[PDB]
Amino acid sequence: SDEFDALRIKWATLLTGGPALDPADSDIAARTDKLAQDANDYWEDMDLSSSRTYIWYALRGNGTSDNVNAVYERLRTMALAATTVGSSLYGNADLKEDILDALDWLYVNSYNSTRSRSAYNWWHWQLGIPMSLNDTAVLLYDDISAARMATYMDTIDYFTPSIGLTGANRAWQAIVVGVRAVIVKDAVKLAAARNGLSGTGIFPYATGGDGFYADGSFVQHTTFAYTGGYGSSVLETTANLMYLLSGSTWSVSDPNQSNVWQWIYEAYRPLLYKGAMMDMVRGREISRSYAQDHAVGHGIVASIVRLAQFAPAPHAAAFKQIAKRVIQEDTFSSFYGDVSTDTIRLAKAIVDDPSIAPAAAPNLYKQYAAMDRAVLQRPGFALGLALYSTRISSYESINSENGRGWYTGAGATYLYNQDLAQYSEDYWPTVDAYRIPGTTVASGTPIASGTGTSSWTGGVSLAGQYGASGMDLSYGAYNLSARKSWFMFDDEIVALGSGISSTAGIPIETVVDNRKLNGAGDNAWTANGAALSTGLGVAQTLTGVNWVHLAGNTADGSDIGYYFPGGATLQTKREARTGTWKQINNRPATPSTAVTRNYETMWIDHGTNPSGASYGYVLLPNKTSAQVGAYAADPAIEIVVNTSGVQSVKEKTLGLVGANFWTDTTQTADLITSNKKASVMTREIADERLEASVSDPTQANNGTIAIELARSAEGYSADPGITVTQLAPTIKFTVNVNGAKGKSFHASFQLG
Ligand SMILES: C[C@]1(C(=O)O)OC[C@H]2O[C@H](O)[C@@H](O)[C@@H](O)[C@@H]2O1
Ligand SMILES: [Ca+2]
C-alpha cells in the first residue's frame, strides 16, 4: 500500500460514505433504497445483448454528448448502488460485470481518442464524462484489470490533460486530472491539480472577469453574477479536492486558500435563506427543474459540511454552526433528501452533537458591487435585488436554456419569507416571464441578452445595516428609460421610479408583484380595508388604492403589504397558468409534463409613450392587513424627492435619509447636497451624532464626490479616502473614489 491507495479509499468513502454507514438511520436508508431502486431500474432495462447498438434505448445515439453524458451518470449510479453499504445491490458481482462491459462498449463505440476534444459541448467530452468515469474507476477499482483500466484513463487524459481555464471550469479540470492521478498513481499530475486551485477564478481574488471578488461577488462567463450557479460548482469541487489532498504530501499550501473561508462568510452565507440559494445569482440554471433553489441550496450546505472536516480551528466550528442552522431551518425539503450518503453521515453528526449550537441568522444589508446585486436579511424576511448595467448582462441563455430570463436581472425584486416554496415547485415555467416583480417593461415584449449602456448601477451601504440601490434604465431592444431606486430600511423597502419615458409605442408598465398563490389560489387579500374577490381567472382594476394586503400561503410569516404614498391605480389579475420546463429549457432530457400554478399579478400601467412618468410603493413584509392600514395612516416613510435627477426617501423613526443623485450637477435632497452622481445615506441621532455613507455606483468617476451636509459638527472620524474640509456651520467633505470599484465610504460626525 502507498499514499495513492489511501487517497483513493478516502475518495471512495466520499462517494459511498465508507463501511461506516449505518443503514439503520432512517435518512441513510431512504437514500439507499432510492439508489438501489434507480440502479435496479436501469440495469433491468439495459440491452445486455452481445451485439447491442446501444446500452439504453432511450439514450441511443453515439454522437450526442448529452446522451453519452447521461449513460455515464447512470453507470456511476449503478456503481454506487453496487458499492454503498445497505444497498439492495451491495457487492453484487453480476452488476459490477455488466457495468464494466458497458464501459468497454463505449470505449470503442462512442468515447475514445477518435472524437474531437472540441466536439459539440466540450464540457461533456472534457469534464462531465470524465468526472463520472473516474468515480466508477475508483469504486470498481479492484474488479478492474490493467488493460481495461487503461482504455479508461488514457482516453480521459486525451480529453483533459491539463489545467488552464477559469473559475468553475478550471476547478473541474483540476478534479478530473486529480482523481485520475490517484488511480494511475501519478504524482506529476496530482501536483498539477493541487496547483490548479491557485489559478484564475479560484483561490486568488479577481479585479475583473471570472472569479470571486473582495466584496463577496462571484462572476463566470465574464459578465454574469453566478454565485449560485457556476459558483456553486466551484465551491463543491474545490472543497472536495481540498479535502482529498488535506493531510497528504500533496496538501494545499498556497496562502490564498484562506480566501475560501471568506467565500462562505461573504459570498454564500448572505445569499442563503432557509435552505435556498437565491435564484438571482444562479443564472441560466433557474431553468433547470432538477436544480431549483432549495435543491441547489442543499448542495451549497453540503460543501460547507465537507469543508468543516479539515478547516482550520476557528472556521471549522463556524461552518458546523452554519450548516446546523440551515439543516434545521429548511422545513420545505429535507436536506438529507438530496445529498450524497457521506454528506448525510457527516451532517447528522453535527446536528446531533448537542455541543454545537446553530449559528445566528444573518441580519444585514450587503452591496455586491462587482455583480450588480444587493441583499437584505431581516429576522422575518430577506430581499434579493437583481440589477444589470454596462458591466453585468441582463441574463444568460445559451444551449437553449433560460429562453425567458429577459427581466430576471433588470431591477427585479425577490422577496423571501416563511413561504419557502415560492420560487420552487415549478415557479419558473409557469410565472408570466414578462412580469417579473419590481421591473419596468414594455408590456409583453422582451429584451436581449447583454450588458446595458448605463454605468449607474449600484448602491451604498450604511455600516452594513441599511442601504440604497439604483439602476439607470435604458433598454437597447426598444426605447425606454427610467430611474429606479430602492431603499432598504428595517421593516420596509421603498421603491421609486422617475423619468419614465418611451416612444416604443407600446404600453409601459411597472410590476409591483407577481406572487404564486396556494393550490386553491384562494389567498385572501384586501385593499383600503375591503376584502377582494378570491376567484381564479378574475382580472380587476383597483383605483385610488392607498394600501393592499395579500395573505401568504402559510398561516403566519408570509403575508405582504403594499403602501402607495400618493395613492395609485393598480391593474391586477389572479389566474392559473400552465407551462412546461421544456418551454424554458429545450434539451432532450428535460420534462415535458404540464404543470399549473396560481398567481396574483399586480402592476402600474404607465400608458403608451409616457414621458416623465413615475411610481412609488413600499413593501411591508409580514404585516397583517390591520397593520398595513395603520402604517398607511401614519407612515414612517416620507418621499423627499422622486425626480429625474435625484430620488430620496427619509425614515422618520430611524433618522435615516437616502438619496441617489443621477447627474453630475449640484443637487440637494433634504440635508444632503452632492455635485456628482452618487448613492448616499445618512443617519441622525438628534443632537448626538450624524453618520453618512457614500459610494460612486458608476465605478467610473476617477476624481471625487464633493458632499455637504446641512448640520453643524464638532468632531469626526472617517474611513481613509475621505477628506473633511469643514465642520461648521455646515459639514463639507470629499470622497476619493478613484478605483473605488463601487465601495461605500463611511464617516461619523459628532454634533454639538
Ligand atoms: C451536466 C450538466 C447539466 O446541468 O445538465 O451538463 C452541462 C454542464 O455545463 C454547464 O456549463 C454547467 O452549468 C453544468 O452545471 C452543466 O451540467
Ligand atoms: Ca420602518
UniProtKB/Swiss-Prot annotation:
Effect of R587A: Increased catalysis rate but decreased affinity with substrate
Superkingdom in the source lineage: Bacteria
CC annotations in GO: extracellular region
Reactions it catalyzes: Eliminative cleavage of the terminal beta-D-mannosyl-(1->4)-beta-D-glucuronosyl linkage of the side-chain of the polysaccharide xanthan, leaving a 4-deoxy-alpha-L-threo-hex-4-enuronosyl group at the terminus of the side-chain
Location, primary (coarse class): secreted
Temperature sensitivity of activity: Optimum temperature is 50 degrees Celsius. Stable at 4 degrees Celsius at pH 6.5 - 9. 60% loss of activity when incubated at 45 degrees Celsius and pH 7.0 for 10 minutes.
A Gene Ontology BP annotation from the UniProt entry: polysaccharide metabolic process
Protein's name according to its UniProt entry: Xanthan lyase
Lineage: Bacteria, Bacillati, Bacillota, Bacilli, Bacillales
Gene for this chain: xly
Region of the whole protein represented: 26 to 777 of 930
